[PDB]
Amino acid sequence: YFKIYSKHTPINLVRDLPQGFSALEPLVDLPIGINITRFQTLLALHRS
Amino acid sequence: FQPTYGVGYQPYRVVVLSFELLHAPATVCGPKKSTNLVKNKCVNFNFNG
Ligand SMILES: *[C@@H]1O[C@H](CO)[C@@H](O)[C@H](O)[C@H]1NC(C)=O
């Protein structure tokens, strides 16, 4: 089972993580049934 | 294929459904039915397992 929990939080701090409490709601459970040992973030370029 | 053929030569559309169980979580389930909810009585309830 692949559990994805998520939370959206409105913050106004400039640099670091804000200090506070926010419990993450369960968003979606995925029936994947596969081995995962590595991950990589996906970003977006800005072209001009 | 022609429409005037015998029953042993007429075209037959065949669909073969193959059901396998793998170690991944099984997700193609049948439609479980829903017995009409009864309130205010001592009943045996089964809600989502
Ligand atoms: C999952 O992948 C890792 C790294 O490839 C491997 O060491 C491990 O044995 C794998 N586990 C299964 C159950 O395939």
Side-chain angles (χ1 to χ4, degrees), chain B residues 6-48:
Chain B
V7 294
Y9 283 78
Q10 273 171 15
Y12 275 66
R13 294 182 164 190
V14 179
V15 172
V16 178
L17 308 167
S18 175
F19 306 125
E20 70 277 13
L21 193 144
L22 191 144
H23 291 173
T27 184
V28 182
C29 295
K32 308 179 183 179
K33 306 302 167 54
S34 150
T35 294
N36 295 351
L37 178 70
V38 174
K39 286 176 285 196
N40 280 293
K41 288 180 70 174
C42 172
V43 301
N44 295 295
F45 61 93
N46 198 325
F47 294 164
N48 295 347

